[PDB]
Structures are given as C-alpha cells and as structure tokens.
C-alpha cells in the first residue's frame, strides 16, 4: 500500500503532539487510532495473503469511516484529474458544406 | 529453579524498601509474599521429590496469579526469540524457467 503507513505515522504523530500540548485525548479516538494501526500492521505482514478483492473492498469501506472522524485521521488525497462533468474539447470541421443522406458530416 | 530465588529476593527487598519509605504495606500483599517464598522453599527443599509434571503445571499456573498482583512481584522475563507470527526468509530459485507436470520447481 505505502499509504496506510503514512496515514498511521501522521495519526500517531498528531496523537503525541496533542499529548504534548495537552495531557488528554479522547479514548474514543484512541480506539480509532488502535483500529487504524492494527489494520496497517495486518495488511503489511504475513496476514495479507488471506485478502480477496471483496475483503479489500470491505476493508477500505470500513477504514473510510475513520477518515474525517477525528483530527488525527484525515481524508487521504490521491492524484486524480477527473470530475462528475467532463469537458467537451471536440472541434467541428465541416466538409464542403456536405450534409449526408440524413446527418451532417465532418472530416 | 534459580529464578524463584531471584523473584523472592526482589519481592522481600521491595517489601522492606516500602517499610523504609512508608510504614505500611497491605497485608493482602504480605499474603502474596508469604505464599511466594513458601513455594520457593517448598520447591528448593526435600519436598521437591513429590511433584509430577501435572503438579508442576498447576504450581506454575497458580504462581502466575501472583505475577502482576502487586508491585513487589513482577512478570519474569525469559530469553525468547519467538512470536505469534514469524518471518519468512526463504528464497525462490527456479531452474532455467522450468516447471513440473503441475507446478513450479527450484534448485
């Protein structure tokens, strides 16, 4: 994966940063941290060979419940260039004003 | 054993250190100290000849109730190189891109 490692490192670093500034973090949030690094350990070891694609789907959809749950776990950002409404850069090049039998015609 | 000796010495030394700093130790823990050193002299005396391996199992599994009961008695640490999930350092070396009638092969 190489990204669960980054997310977990960021999460525990933020956890201990809060324990440095403050002396308290919600244990309801420490539970999410615990789930996160347990999954990170399990997927990056000898236990990943039991993972199917359905298992991967379920694991990802369960992990995304942790995404914006706390300040420590944050929504990951991936490299994407898409959107729900894509652009139309096609160009119109008519040929000799030629209509076809029914439709118009281009190059 | 040679280790019940160390645990008993540590426990009673901690007991008298507490009686030096404070002037009181819970007698519910003095009971545990009494049981511990009584067992060690039981096992390092002339009564060590009446013990089977089942008796050894029972004695160890009963002494481990005293392990983290109080600060005087601690969990003993042994020299261990194991874990619940081990590492796979085996290496893969096939023979000139060959296979068996069903599967792959190596040196």
């Amino acid at each position: 994966m190489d990204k669960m490692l980054e997310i977990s490192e960021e999460a525990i670093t933020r956890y201990f940063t809060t324990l440095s500034q403050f002396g308290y973090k919600k244990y309801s949030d420490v539970d999410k941290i615990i789930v996160l690094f347990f999954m990170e350990e399990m997927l990056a070891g000898e236990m990943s060979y039991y993972v199917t694609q359905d298992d991967y789907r379920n694991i990802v959809n369960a992990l995304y419940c942790l995404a914006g749950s706390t300040c420590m776990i944050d929504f990951p950002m991936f490299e994407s260039y898409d959107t729900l409404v894509h652009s139309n850069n096609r160009t119109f090049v008519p040929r000799i004003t030629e209509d076809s039998i029914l439709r118009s015609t281009e190059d | 054993m040679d280790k019940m000796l160390e645990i008993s010495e540590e426990a009673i030394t901690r007991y008298f250190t507490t009686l030096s700093q404070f002037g009181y130790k819970k007698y519910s823990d003095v009971d545990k100290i009494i049981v511990l050193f009584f067992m060690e002299e039981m096992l390092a005396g002339e009564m060590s000849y009446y013990v089977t391996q089942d008796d050894y199992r029972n004695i160890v599994n009963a002494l481990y109730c005293l392990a983290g009961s109080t600060c005087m008695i601690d969990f003993p640490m042994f020299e261990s190189y194991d874990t619940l999930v081990h590492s796979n350092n085996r290496t893969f070396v096939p023979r000139i891109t060959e296979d068996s009638i069903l599967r792959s092969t190596e040196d």
């Binding site: 990943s48 993972v51 199917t52 991967y56 | 792959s104």
Partner: peptide, 19 residues
C-alpha cells in the same frame, strides 16, 4: 501497492502458462 489473492492467482497461472 497491495495484492489480493486474485492477483497472485493471475501471476502464478500466467507464469505456468509460459513454462
């Protein structure tokens, strides 16, 4: 990167196909 079992099935089966 993360492999599932099906990835390993693909890789091994295709390797045996080429042996």
């Amino acid at each position: 990167m993360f492999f599932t079992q099906e990835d390993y099935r693909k890789i091994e089966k295709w390797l045996l196909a080429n042996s």
